[PDB]
Design a protein around this ligand. Structure first.
Ligand SMILES: [Fe+3]
Ligand SMILES: [Fe+3]
Ligand SMILES: [Mn+2]
Ligand SMILES: [Mn+2]
Lengths: 323, 323
């Protein structure tokens, strides 16, 4: 039925072609202290963000899920301005990053007060059923993240909170996996606490190339995402070549009703402008919102995937996920 | 001669009685993502902050150094408003927190671009010689922090940057030590890179009770601080009893020209409001800006310390430090 976007509630029928994981705004926790050399280009950032939405709208996309966590400069009103100008639908999130690239100390401190997991739940409920700050916007998904090879104590507080929240709300859960680890464990641990696998998207699965690992995850009946198309050389991540050679294994075996695709782009960066060093800067030349529809998809056809199947992924699956 | 406060440059002669370490505003990194339940009480916070300044002004304090790091919600314009209303002098900082209660990922990421330590220097120079963001305020001190028993790789980038900045500027360095560790190592590592010990305040020394350790540190000719008076029972911290019994050892042995005192208070908290749990909330009942002048000081007299000596600590030392 209905899904909360930044422009208030929307019928899931009208979601349409959907990218599951892209950032308009993103900054690594700590960017706020580099304000002096990295002040936020308020009205140019908006100009770039609308550039990316119009760039997405023209390949038939009607909906983006933006899972930018609360500590990476999530900005729902900004996003609201973008949708108001483009008509694109934008679903935002409620969540923190993970230990390795998040902001532990604050909730670490409350953990000592004994109230952290309640506070995270209370925050999740608030942002899902009341609205984010005074923006009036509710998050449409819960963002979760785990570390490499571990779901830390701190992360588990959020997983628990997240599972208990979803039971109270029916919110979709979207997750981050670190370097192709902890897919199954994530699914397992959320299902243990009463989350519903049909309302769960294990993310960054494209970060493992052994399809055995994906199947172990799909077996929970959760959705999985290859949401990092375009990112190469970094994090130890595999090439777009590996992804497709890993993606195709799961398509012929008819799992497409559990797979969705994205790029995990950052269209505007918070903090100090930077430019990638020259080894790095050519491997990730393809990391942009165009990448899938002009490259990844044609490649998929040449290896024989029905356009019907893809529609399950970009339209059916997301419509399914949110209902 | 001159020191940069939030109200522009000021003659060091007019610093006067000085608290070396107190926060008006503070939040643990991550507080920004708890915005919905923890929105910043803009104009009440200002009302509380002026309460604390007026409360400090009446025990003769004319100057506070507020070392709130860039990632813990440092707010120089806010501070500026406080001084403009009270006439108090407020010197702010340029720094990041340490790894355990800091926000590593952002500078961690730049470390991979190969430019982090330059960027930290460039940030330090900017905030010391040009101004913080568009506030026009320059930091008067550099804030540095290390972990328990370790000065991590990440922290050393900032120490190096900090030492090279001070050489270019003459800025005072103020530091944080974790649980009474790394005093000497900090001094040693800064002196190695050309920092001047007479422009350095090793902080949280009151976190070690073995005076042997302090002397090892004082031997570098750096200043040291017992800046956590009132914080008891927490972090592994020692009682105000231990501090004084540790402080007195260094006074009779005539080091007072290297010691200064504070409380390290947080007069307004960013993030979700909270009550300290029932055990904790008793031990730290004394953690407030009044604590020193009404309690710690009388206690010091009864054990026979000349008011002249104290003046070296609250007036002479700081005046010395900044010139
Ligand atoms: Fe992402
Ligand atoms: Fe402090
Ligand atoms: Mn991610
Ligand atoms: Mn500190």
């Amino acid at each position: 039925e209905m899904v909360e976007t930044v422009c208030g509630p929307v019928p899931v029928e009208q979601l349409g072609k959907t990218l599951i994981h892209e950032h308009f705004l993103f900054g690594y926790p700590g960017f706020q202290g580099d304000v002096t050399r990295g002040t936020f280009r308020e009205d140019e950032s908006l100009r770039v963000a609308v550039e990316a939405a119009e760039k997405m709208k023209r390949h038939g996309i009607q909906t983006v899920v933006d899972p930018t966590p609360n500590d990476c400069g999530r900005n729902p009103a900004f996003l609201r301005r973008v949708a108001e100008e483009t008509g694109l639908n934008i679903i935002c999130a409620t969540g923190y990053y993970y230990n390795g690239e998040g902001a532990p100390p604050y909730f670490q401190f409350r953990r000592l007060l004994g109230t952290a997991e309640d506070d995270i739940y209370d925050m999740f409920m608030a942002e899902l059923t009341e609205g984010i700050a005074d923006t009036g916007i509710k998050a449409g998904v819960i963002k979760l993240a785990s570390s490499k090879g571990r779901i830390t104590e701190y992360e588990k507080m959020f997983f628990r909170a997240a599972a208990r929240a979803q039971k109270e709300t029916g919110a979709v859960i979207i997750t981050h996996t670190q370097e192709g680890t902890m897919g199954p464990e994530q699914a397992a641990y959320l299902l243990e606490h009463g989350a519903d696998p049909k309302k769960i998207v294990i993310g960054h699965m494209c970060g493992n190339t052994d399809p055995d690992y994906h199947r172990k995850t799909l077996a929970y009946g959760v959705y999985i995402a290859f949401d990092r198309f375009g990112i190469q050389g970094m994090v130890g991540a595999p090439t777009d070549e590996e992804r497709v050679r890993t993606l195709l294994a799961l398509l012929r075996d008819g799992y497409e009703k559990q797979i969705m695709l994205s790029h995990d782009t950052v269209n505007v960066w918070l903090g100090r402008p930077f430019t990638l060093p020259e080894p790095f800067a050519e491997m990730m030349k393809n990391w942009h919102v165009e990448h899938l529809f002009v490259n990844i998809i044609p490649a998929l056809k040449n290896e024989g995937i029905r356009d019907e199947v893809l529609e399950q992924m970009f339209i059916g699956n997301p419509a399914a996920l949110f209902s």
